[PDB]
Amino acid sequence: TPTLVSLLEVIEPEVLYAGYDSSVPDSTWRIMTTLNMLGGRQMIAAVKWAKAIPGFRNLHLDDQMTLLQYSWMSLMAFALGWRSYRQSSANLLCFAPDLIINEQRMTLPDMYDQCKHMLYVSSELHRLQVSYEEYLCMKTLLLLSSVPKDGLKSQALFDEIRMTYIKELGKAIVKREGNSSQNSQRFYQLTKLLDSMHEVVENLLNYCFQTFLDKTMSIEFPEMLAEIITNQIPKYSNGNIKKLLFHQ
């Protein structure tokens, strides 16, 4: 019987390439377009990933759709932060091996306003020295971080699944053997970072929603992202979101 965290580890998505032509000069519009197209492919891989998370496919099909639609940006910002934290201790965003947002790219007009929210995530993972096992538990928890204000169809089963992954995070913390009081502080710190992802995501979504709606910017979004954004905009307008928190 393999451990739950080992089942989350084996389903880690493959690293995707942007297909970014480095011989042509850079621009924020060019990079933003390429990253949106790459983002759609990341989200298609995220559906495959979520379907293999133990318990996820036992939820009502509508709840599966709901959870991926609320959490999409949280998953993407967190997975990006981890990849950026692993490649370097520098201020780099590793979106793809062929498309890294370096210091030169960060100075491109308007590049930083969106990239800073992503930089915060990698900065925090580096500051807290988050482990691979802690990260895997945390990323599954982000998929389960928001629900509709009237709840899910399989709400009882969801609460059971969420509790199981909270317990898995606790087990990952204990493995990094420190005194009982230090493990209490670590759980507090990592769950505080999880809570702060709602604000990181709110900032990313504010800019993302505006960019998608303003057709005069000519910023293309692939079908996968356009569909998620089209679904999510009216949900935020009608207050149809309950952001789950560990602290208050």
């Binding site: 298609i44 559906v47 495959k48 379907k51 293999a52 099909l61 599966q64 759709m65 991926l68 639609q69 079908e223 996968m224 569909e227 998620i228 679904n231």
Partner: peptide, 13 residues
């Protein structure tokens, strides 16, 4: 409504 997402969840991987 959310045609693509529904297709990806319902199809066999």
């Amino acid at each position: 409504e959310n045609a693509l997402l529904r297709y990806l969840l319902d199809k066999d991987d």
